[PDB]
Amino acid sequence: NKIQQINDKELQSGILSPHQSWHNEYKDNAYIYIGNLNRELTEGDILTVFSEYGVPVDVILSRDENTGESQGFAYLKYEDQRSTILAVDNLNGFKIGGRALKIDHTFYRPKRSLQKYYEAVKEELDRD
């Protein structure tokens, strides 16, 4: 896990400031990439693990257009962008149901074929 190696070397250099961090590049990005998921975990199951580090306002699990089953990666946006640093360097390499997940910062591009999916997601997270 390369992200977990560069946080150890950053922490030993005594950097500890977010603006001197390698995280600083992604200060405008509130989305995260989540990868190497187990196939049984779902959208409401992703919001449960990742709510430890903040309030997730959008979520997208990517799953095939034919068979409708999980490709094994998702996307999640937090209300506060500093929750992104939390999730990235504190939940990375965490074994969940056999496999260790990979979290990275990201720029998310929404698509047209998942449009009404985005309101089937939004009406859950508009409740809270």
Partner: protein, 243 residues
Amino acid sequence: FWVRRVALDRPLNKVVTYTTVTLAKKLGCSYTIDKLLTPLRDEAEPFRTMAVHAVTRTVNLLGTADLDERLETRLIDALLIAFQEQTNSDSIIFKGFGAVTVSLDIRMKPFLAPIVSTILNHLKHKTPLVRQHAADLCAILIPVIKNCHEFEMLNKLNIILYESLGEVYPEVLGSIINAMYCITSVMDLDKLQPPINQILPTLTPILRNKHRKVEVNTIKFVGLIGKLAPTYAPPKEWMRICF
């Protein structure tokens, strides 16, 4: 690929750096060094070091004859910032200064007076590691100060380095002696300030220092004088060195 996260893992770091020195044969040195000026002044330390490696390997390929007067100004200013911010004993910033100053030799001449006063300032600083790097940068610059013919500047550095030979920190003291060795083997021995008959008796008790960086630097500077100016010490003083 010139981002802070690439500089933190060493195997991506060495691959991005080799690609930059490969691509700079086509792009040129003036295009490439202009792109490296922002990582040379970044707040993160190991991203700043990655840029110093790419600068040294580019200038060693291509020279600095491509660079105009404004990039020579901006390049030297950036190297000085990366020297002023260094907090660990990594040596590439000194290999970086030696590469750039050997490239542009006489073009280096308007930059000599502010760098020397910066070196003289850091020799007054309370951190020993700051004093040590200052005398390391002094020793790198000596053949370029000679080539620019600034003999009044070499004798100012040598009298001030002589006043620091009483230093207690051995890693600082050894690099002071190395720089006095580097000035002395350049100069005319009669024109040297202070004279050799003052310098050599001050070196003789320093041979009893037990640290290795002081020792191997002092034997070279006693042996340089014994080649070049042996009659400036009495014979009973040369026997105290033999013992």
